[PDB]
């Protein structure tokens, strides 16, 4: 129908939203060719939920998959015994997520499994699906009048109709596919009917990076991992990690077609190579540059003014208490630590109090990249790489480039017992994950 595929939303009615989803295996029709993918609500992304804070929030989730599963709603500071990553939903069994969307909250979330040891296959597989969050800000004429999108990145590899079966190499670089789509389309065409669009942004790969870069135009940065920045930032391109997402604002300064393409970008990713008693691992260097769509301006864009405030940024009290987190790899073994340990369901690794601050200084001594993600607790990224942080936002989750160390100032919110972990996926299942609880 529309030109632009993009997900199916359900919306709250009167301040409810109340829905039953399954996931399971689904026959579609995907970049043109036929498949059998893994899925919430029939779809490919699954559909989105858009709520307004304060709203009640009802998920049936019934598994029809031949394996357990369960639900990370990503990005809500809602309490861990609902969003519960040691909750198992096994096969033909159903869980109801019933949680209120907290009152200051607004941007876009998203929602896929979280059962150590199987999250990389289900949601490479295609299991994940956005929420948004609407807000009051929505209203002023700067936004509303804009042209809204949402875009999940999400890249697949097929195999005889199927999700391409993980590799050795893909559970040590995490796992990327060819099919590089937008809203589960290939190469999609945006027909744009305003000069501004005010574009949603999800990274729900397993380890593909997004260097975004619109042919020809800056971004408008507007909304971070979990809300509004407190004023637009021009940026020339937006580097989008597993796990992240952003909001743009696109001013279309004349008629044309123009790229949104995904700049090349090493990761640190690695091969292996034998040149005569070598057998060692070689990087494998930047990514190939990828088309993510084709934009076609209107006819005379006038776009917008941009808006002069979004949101403040809340002032925090002053922090108790300072963390360190070491980051490394053992790439033979495909194994990853964190001040080197591996994940342990039984054992708690950090204890902190609620409605108390602590900074936490992650520190990434591996070789690759790592997407550092706090479940419950959104933060904010005071400076990665000795680099200060060029706006205030929350985020829940920050790239650590090999060497670098991040400083994140994170309040301390719901209690009780909940994870950190990278978010290349394949990464966490092989240990790279640890526990913090909140009394
Ligand atoms: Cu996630
Ligand atoms: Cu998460
Ligand atoms: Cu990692
Ligand atoms: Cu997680």
Redesign the pocket.
């Known amino acids: 129908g529309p030109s632009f595929p993009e997900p199916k939303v359900v919306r709250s009615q009167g301040g409810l939203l109340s829905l039953k989803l399954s996931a399971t295996p689904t026959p579609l029709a995907i970049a043109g060719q036929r498949a059998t993918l893994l899925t919430y609500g029939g779809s490919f992304p699954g559909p989105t939920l858009r709520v307004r804070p304060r709203d009640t929030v009802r998920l049936t989730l019934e598994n029809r998959l031949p394996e357990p599963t369960n639900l990370?709603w990503?990005g809500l500071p809602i309490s861990p015994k609902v969003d519960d990553?040691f909750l198992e939903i096994p096969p033909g069994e159903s869980w109801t997520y019933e949680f209120t969307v907290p009152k200051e909250l607004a941007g876009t979330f998203w929602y896929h499994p979280?059962l150590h040891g199987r999250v990389a296959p289900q949601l490479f597989a295609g299991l994940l699906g956005a929420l948004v969050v609407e807000s009051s800000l929505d209203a002023i004429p700067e936004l509303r009048e804009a042209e809204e999108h949402l875009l999940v990145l999400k890249d697949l590899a097929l195999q005889g109709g199927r999700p391409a079966p993980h590799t050795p190499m893909d559970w040590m670089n995490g796992k990327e596919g060819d099919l590089v789509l937008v809203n589960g389309a290939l190469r999609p065409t945006l027909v744009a009917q305003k000069a501004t669009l005010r574009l949603r942004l999800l990274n729900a790969s397993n380890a593909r990076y997004y260097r975004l870069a619109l042919q020809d135009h800056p971004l408008y940065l507007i909304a971070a991992d979990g809300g509004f920045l407190e004023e637009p930032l021009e940026v020339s391109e937006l580097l989008l990690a597993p796990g992240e997402r952003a909001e743009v604002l696109v001013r279309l300064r004349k008629e044309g077609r123009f790229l949104l393409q995904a700049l090349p970008y090493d990761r640190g990713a690695m091969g292996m190579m034998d040149m005569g008693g070598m057998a060692h691992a070689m990087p494998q260097g930047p990514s190939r540059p990828e088309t993510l769509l084709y934009l076609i301006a209107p006819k005379n864009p006038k776009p917008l003014p941009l808006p002069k405030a979004l949101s403040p940024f809340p002032t925090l009290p002053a922090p108790v208490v300072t963390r360190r987190l070491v980051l490394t790899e053992d790439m033979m073994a495909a194994r990853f630590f964190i001040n080197g340990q591996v994940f342990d369901h039984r054992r708690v690794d950090l204890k902190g109090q609620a409605q108390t601050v602590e900074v936490w200084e992650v520190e990434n001594q591996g070789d690759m990249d790592h997407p550092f993600?706090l479940?419950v607790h959104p933060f904010q990224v005071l400076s990665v790489g000795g680099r200060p942080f060029p706006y205030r936002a929350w985020k829940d989750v920050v790239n650590l480039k090999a060497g670098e160390v991040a400083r994140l100032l994170v309040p301390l919110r719901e209690k009780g017992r909940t994870?950190f972990?990278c978010?290349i996926v394949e990464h966490?299942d092989r240990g790279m994950?640890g526990v913090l609880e909140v009394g």
């Open positions: 990370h990503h990553p979280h993600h479940h994870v972990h978010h966490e994950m």
